[PDB]
Design a protein around this nucleic acid. Sequence first.
DNA 1: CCCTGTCGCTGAGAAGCGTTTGC
DNA 2: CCCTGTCGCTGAGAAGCGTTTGC
Lengths: 103, 103
Amino acid sequence: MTLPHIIRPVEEVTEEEIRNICSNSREKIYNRSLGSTCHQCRQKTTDTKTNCRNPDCWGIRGQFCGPCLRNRYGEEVKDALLDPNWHCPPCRGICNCSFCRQR
Amino acid sequence: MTLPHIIRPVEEVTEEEIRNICSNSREKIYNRSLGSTCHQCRQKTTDTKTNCRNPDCWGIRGQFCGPCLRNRYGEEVKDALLDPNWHCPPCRGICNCSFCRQR
DNA sequence: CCCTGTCGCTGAGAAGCGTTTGC
DNA sequence: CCCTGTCGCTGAGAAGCGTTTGC
Ligand SMILES: [Mg+2]
Ligand SMILES: [Mg+2]
Ligand SMILES: [Mg+2]
Ligand SMILES: [Mg+2]
Ligand SMILES: [Mg+2]
Ligand SMILES: [Zn+2]
Ligand SMILES: [Zn+2]
Ligand SMILES: [Zn+2]
Ligand SMILES: [Zn+2]
Ligand SMILES: [Zn+2]
Ligand SMILES: [Zn+2]
């Protein structure tokens, strides 16, 4: 049931993705099929989300939406998309989501 | 892919299972379909194996064969089968298998 | 009134072939 | 010669709807 984690190279990042990076959490479009789930807010939406470049990462715990990465970690998804060494907060052990903060 | 853990009540234990409890690890019968995997020796065989009664347990980590439970923990599978409060060594945090001993 | 924001819950949390059997 | 025994490796290690959005 685990979704395979695929590292999208920075060269394959397209302008359409940056344009679709969410800037308002209430301006999201839900889609049970094409949407992606943000690890932080746990919403499956169609806005562009981060891609963890850590090979040891797995699943969707490396996927963060615009508002969540902006407000919970002070980082921009556009910068994370273009960063080839970017690691997700779960990989860095700094994730402050409701599940990761207790454990 | 996780096999559902089902608690078999002690009243439903049958004599055919005790007779099929393994007494020699080299006298096992491998079966990819009907066999069960012992958590300790990681062999999928048809001999009777333990059933963990802990509701919080999951998967097959509570399944131990005759020789493994006898030699690695000093307990008999027949006694474990008839014990309604029996917990697997992984549940007790005392498992000494090659994977559990390091972690 | 201002940096336009977030957690609960369920079900989830491997298994088994291969290279495997003591001093 | 005796209590008739065991580990490596791969792939595994959730996700997302619902009850969800700041002081
Ligand atoms: Mg699974
Ligand atoms: Mg569900
Ligand atoms: Mg379950
Ligand atoms: Mg395999
Ligand atoms: Mg894998
Ligand atoms: Zn989010
Ligand atoms: Zn990661
Ligand atoms: Zn987290
Ligand atoms: Zn065994
Ligand atoms: Zn157990
Ligand atoms: Zn173990």
